Amino acid sequence: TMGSGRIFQIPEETIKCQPFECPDHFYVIDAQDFGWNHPQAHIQLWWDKDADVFYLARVWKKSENTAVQAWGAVKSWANKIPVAWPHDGHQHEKGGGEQLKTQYADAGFSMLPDHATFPDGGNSVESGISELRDLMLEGRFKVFNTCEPFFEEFRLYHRDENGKIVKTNDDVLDATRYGYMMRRFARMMRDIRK
Ligand SMILES: [Mg+2]
Ligand SMILES: [Mg+2]
Q1: Where is the signal peptide, in residue numbers?
Q2: Hey, is 41 helix, strand or coil?
Q3: Which residue(s) pair with 110 in the sheet?
């Protein structure tokens, strides 16, 4: 049921924090996981580069919404923030990552030019999960207590009987991971418009 075990064996309360207003010197980045039948997710991550601490500050998750509807639901916080997004092509062909990113850009999101990668061009999920777990354990990854869809997924994220990530209920998790991977594109809060 939880396979060979949960991926993040960390008490939720250790990574949960009270919401606060973003300081001018924090960096801000958004991320998107695409989805129609599956939920899509749009998240916002704050990065204190001085303390090197990450805050998952905003989360929106919803099935069967268009890009126009997503923008209407999150534009209050998503406006002008660069957006990381997945998909180097293949999902039984047709318009995957790049065509969907266009629909989202047209809807008003500041979509980043390229799909989410680490600095070296890689996109390993395993690598992202390891780095995120380290941050959690070191007290350097926090989630606002108002971002409940993160915790819902966090609780269920597990590996199958052979040790592979079971890729379900992981839209907010994926988005969070994309924002983290692309953190070099995060913009300083005071330079946004402030
Ligand atoms: Mg789909
Ligand atoms: Mg998904």
Answers
A1: none
A2: strand
A3: 82
Ordered structural domains, the chain, with CATH: 1-194 (3.30.420.280)
Q: At what angle do helices 148-156 and 171-181 cross, to 10 degrees?
A: 100
Specify the amino acid at residue 79.
Answer: N
**76 alpha carbon – ligand 1 mean position (Å):** 26
> Binding site for Mg(2+): residue ranges?
33, 171
In order, the DSSP letters of 120-164 are: TS---HHHHHHHHHHHHHTT-EEEETT-HHHHHHHHH-EE-TTS-
Q: How many whole angstroms from 89 Cα to the centroid of ligand 1?
A: 14
Question: How remote is the CA of residue 91 from the centroid of ligand 1, in Å?
Answer: 9
Q: For residues 142 and 154, give the distance between their C-alpha atoms in angstroms, rounded to a whole number.
A: 13
Contact assessment for residue 81 and residue 45, using Cβ atoms and an 8 Å cutoff: no
Cα 140 to ligand 1 centroid, rounded to whole Å:
33
What are the two backbone dihedrals, phi and then psi, of residue 77, each rounded to the nearest 5 degrees? -105, -25
Q: What is the resolution of this structure in A?
A: 2.0
